[PDB]
Amino acid sequence: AEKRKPIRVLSLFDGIATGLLVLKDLGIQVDRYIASEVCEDSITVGMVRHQGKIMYVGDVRSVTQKHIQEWGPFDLVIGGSPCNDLSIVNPARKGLYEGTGRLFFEFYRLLHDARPKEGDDRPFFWLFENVVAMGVSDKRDISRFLESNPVMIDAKEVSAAHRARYFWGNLPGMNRPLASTVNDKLELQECLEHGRIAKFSKVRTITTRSNSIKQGKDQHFPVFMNEKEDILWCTEMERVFGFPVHYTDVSNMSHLARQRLLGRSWSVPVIRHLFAPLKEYFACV
Amino acid sequence: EKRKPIRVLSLFDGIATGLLVLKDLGIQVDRYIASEVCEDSITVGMVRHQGKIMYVGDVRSVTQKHIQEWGPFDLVIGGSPCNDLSIVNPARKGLYEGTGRLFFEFYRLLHDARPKEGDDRPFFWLFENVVAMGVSDKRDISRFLESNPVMIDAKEVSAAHRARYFWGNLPGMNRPLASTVNDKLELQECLEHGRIAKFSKVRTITTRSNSIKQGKDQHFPVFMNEKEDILWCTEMERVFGFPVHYTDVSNMSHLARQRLLGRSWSVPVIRHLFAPLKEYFACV
Amino acid sequence: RQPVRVLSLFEDIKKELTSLGFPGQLKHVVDVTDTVRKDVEEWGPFDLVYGATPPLGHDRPPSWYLFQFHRLLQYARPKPGSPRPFFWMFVDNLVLNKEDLDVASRFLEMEPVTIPDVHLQNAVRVWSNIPAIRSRHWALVSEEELSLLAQNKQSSKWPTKLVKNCFLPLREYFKYF
Amino acid sequence: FETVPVWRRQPVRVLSLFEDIKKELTSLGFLESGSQLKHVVDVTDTVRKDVEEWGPFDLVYGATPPLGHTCDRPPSWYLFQFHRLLQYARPKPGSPRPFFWMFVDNLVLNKEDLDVASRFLEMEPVTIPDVLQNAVRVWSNIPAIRSRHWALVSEEELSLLAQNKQSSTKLVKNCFLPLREYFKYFS
DNA sequence: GCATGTGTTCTAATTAGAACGCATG
DNA sequence: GCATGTGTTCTAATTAGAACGCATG
Ligand SMILES: Nc1ncnc2c1ncn2[C@@H]1O[C@H](CSCC[C@H](N)C(=O)O)[C@@H](O)[C@H]1O
Ligand SMILES: Nc1ncnc2c1ncn2[C@@H]1O[C@H](CSCC[C@H](N)C(=O)O)[C@@H](O)[C@H]1O
């Protein structure tokens, strides 16, 4: 038989390169990882933590179908478009069709370009993520532009924070029941630095906004330290998301500049479960 | 008969540099009692050493009875604030006012912690401060400690100038320094990937950021992607010899961390000075 | 040269279908939000697909029509081995702003052509694989007068004389009369 | 601690820093008028063995300069320098003779200059008055000083006097009387 | 010579917390 | 019923920028 080949990945709206981090943690070999991103803080994180393996190609609207054909073929296409104009948390959400919402169609566009032409039964996988706190119509429109309906996976089942997120794609078993394992930190206590006491087992969804860290309407500091209450530190938010400690400690970024990056990113253990079946399709360590 | 773990008193501990090197030398530490008041300083030591450090607050609140109760101490180390002794401050209030007088609290507690007469029990002490101080402030400190200092610049064992005076009695305190195969003597060996160094070594890093900017024309030390940049604090920790992300605690900004780093010791310099202590105490 | 099967979306092209020379055998879809692949596929095979933005003055986002047009056109494309010539075009009531302009051309891999009505008067930008609308140079106009044509035309209407003139050269492929 | 008969008491040997006190020792006869006393006022370069080879000492005294302008050094300088040479003169554990020391403030040390004083001499001071003619603060291991309870005086009352000699002797020599019983008296 | 320096006190940059605001399941 | 949220604008309160300094090797 033919031997399994390293994976070739196109990642749209890469962010802090969570996808590559997950592929590496699974022993999956990666021949090329082409990222489209604009935030220089995000590119710096990925450049540093992956030593420049990532080929950054800039604004996704600069990627053309010609480029997809030349840089390909791709075995995996992943992306998570901005939701500032999509989720009902923003009273001034500009909707799917204006602002940053329409950027989703660049994903729909580039997905169509990287798909194998008809008559090419090579394995091809894609994943698209966005929130569930979106409008009912913009959920169905995305589902009708991708021609599939999403799966909602809450990081609460594998981490110490709630995170109801929608996942569109064709990943094998990406609907099988999510199961916890040795490596998952389900409790907030297991993500704190030494000497700090967790008040709760789980934290409500973490966004870019600072005081999404206090639980409830009544501003509950989630941690005791010494004679005072406290908020979650940057290092501990990384642990709640499942990143390595100090992943985002790059380029003198403030703790808020770091929370911006984390607040938009993925739950690593969730993506790990979704990617894990790919181990049987591509070369591993 | 057998080697016993070391008992330490650290005054103006800062970010527990003294405990960092006793650990990295395999020296077993019975107790490490630190006097410190900056809560950012204390948090680093609390987190990075898992509550090993006994914190005792303001040094001016340390009595003799406290020293007798907490001791006996085999090692006494400290470096008192220099912001009223460093000539870099045009408003320096001197050794006898401001925070300069905090040195005498060290001289006071060192006297309290010394063993009684005829007690041959081994006992070591170390005191650090800056070289850019007054010649009269230098004269008085050596008179109060009854010994002259040794000057050591961290540039011999690191990528940063840091000329410092060291009073003490540790074995070999003025034997010369040899860069170990472990030491990172070039600025390039401390940068994160993708960055290139415009200099071999840097000038002394203070608490204000613009200390990184070198020369008299004020020059950035690093180029990244065709453009120039200052040092990152993780790079600064490497420049000082600390583990990378050592000071990444408590949501501290990069200027807050540089404040902690700018007041500390260069780790390889302290590692050398503490090297002969391995024979005096239990080492695992 | 057999007859023609053509999807019209957002605009009922039944007005000038007969007049150019072409149960009935046209399909026209209104609100495509619930259309899927199976719907377009069971509606028979097609050889041109036409979409239109509504005329100025009236409703819902101007790029909603483009994206919905794009997804249906891909649903209606044949297998690349099919011989019957396939055609398509979106046409613009000068409704899309400069931002929506580049999105439309990037999504159809072609820059538009702006037709005139000066005898200026009315104008429409249109993208299409038809090799004759790119072939045919029409009198060159501006965007300044085009932007000066919108604010006035808005203050008060599909001009398909320009459209009929546009997709006229599509009869070499299908029966007349 | 425990006294001794008169024939065993020998003449005290004193170190006076900052303030000469010879003419304060004749009036009560701790000395001989025919010239065993050492007195330095600039003690910056005074090393330790200097003190040791100045003879063993029984009473080491220092005082801040009185209210005026002759205070060239900073006020706290006198306390630290006194504490420094104090340890130099302190005898061994098995102290045969009795050892005493005292530091005196003539209302020059401020509130936080007094706490470091009490921190460095390990006891709060005593306010010795000449009631409201004058007053001084005194640190010392003389058992009579910290025991004999003087006239009470307020801090607002001491601030004014410290500021009245600002804006502008025997009955306070009560600090030295309890050391006649330890050293020879001279007729 | 003269540049170097465990820092101040000033200006403008964030930080920041609070204040919205309601679909949706 | 109810509150939960990959957000933005803001305004007070902080924090992060540029000059002044001159013993001392
Ligand atoms: N026009 C554009 N081109 C490329 N990336 C863009 C973009 N506009 C926004 N983005 C990026 O899209 C991201 C959406 S949030 C997704 C983050 C990513 N999934 C992660 O794991 O970190 C943001 O980081 C944003 O910087
Ligand atoms: N009154 C006081 N009591 C105890 N510590 C004090 C103090 N005043 C200042 N300090 C501390 O003294 C330190 C002087 S800088 C010394 C830091 C240490 N040598 C290190 O390597 O990290 C500062 O951290 C400051 O917080």
Residue numbers in the entry:
A (entry chain D): 628 to 912
B (entry chain A): 629 to 912
C (entry chain C): 187 to 208, 215 to 250, 253 to 313, 317 to 353, 358 to 378
D (entry chain B): 179 to 213, 217 to 312, 317 to 353, 361 to 379
Quote what the paper states about this structure.
Mammalian DNA methylation is established by de novo DNA methyltransferases DNMT3A and DNMT3B4, and subsequently subjected to maintenance by DNA methyltransferase DNMT1 in a replication-dependent manner. DNMT3A-mediated DNA methylation is further regulated by DNMT3-like protein (DNMT3L) during gametogenesis and embryogenesis. Among these, mutation of DNMT3A has been identified in ~25% acute myeloid leukemia (AML) patients, which gives rise to aberrant DNA methylation patterns and increased cell proliferation, and correlates with poor clinical outcome. To gain further insights into the context-dependent DNA methylation by DNMT3A and the mutational effect of R882H, we determined the crystal structure of wild-type DNMT3A (DNMT3AWT)–DNMT3L tetramer in complex with a CGA motif-containing DNA, as well as R882H-mutated DNMT3A (DNMT3AR882H)–DNMT3L tetramer in complex with CGA- and CGT-containing DNAs.
Next, to elucidate how the R882H mutation influences the context-dependent DNA methylation by DNMT3A, we characterized the structure of the DNMT3AR882H–DNMT3L tetramer in complex with SAH and CGT-containing DNA (DNMT3AR882H–CGT), with the same sequence as that previously used for crystalizing the DNMT3AWT–CGT complex. The structure of the DNMT3AR882H–CGT complex was solved at 2.6 Å resolution, well aligned with that of the DNMT3AWT–CGT complex, with an RMSD of 0.37 Å over 849 aligned Cα atoms. Structural comparison of the DNMT3AR882H–CGT and DNMT3AWT–CGT complexes again reveals a difference in the DNA conformation: relative to the DNMT3AWT-bound DNA, the DNMT3AR882H-bound DNA moves away from the RD interface by ~3 Å, reflective of reduced protein–DNA contact. Of particular note, the side chains of residues H882 and R887 in the DNMT3AR882H–CGT complex are positioned further away from the DNA backbone than their counterparts in the DNMT3AWT–CGT complex. As a result of these structural changes, protein–DNA contact at the RD interface in the DNMT3AR882H–CGT complex accounts for a buried surface area of ~206 Å2 only, much less than that for the DNMT3AWT–CGT complex. The molecular environment for the TRD loop between the DNMT3AR882H–CGT and DNMT3AWT–CGT complexes also appears distinct: First, as in the DNMT3AR882H–CGA complex, the intramolecular hydrogen bond formed between residues S837 and R882 in the DNMT3AWT–CGT complex becomes abolished in the DNMT3AR882H–CGT complex. Second, the DNA molecules in the DNMT3AR882H–CGT and DNMT3AWT–CGT complexes show differential extent of helical twist: In comparison with the DNMT3AWT–CGT complex, the DNA major groove in the DNMT3AR882H–CGT complex is positioned further away from the TRD loop.
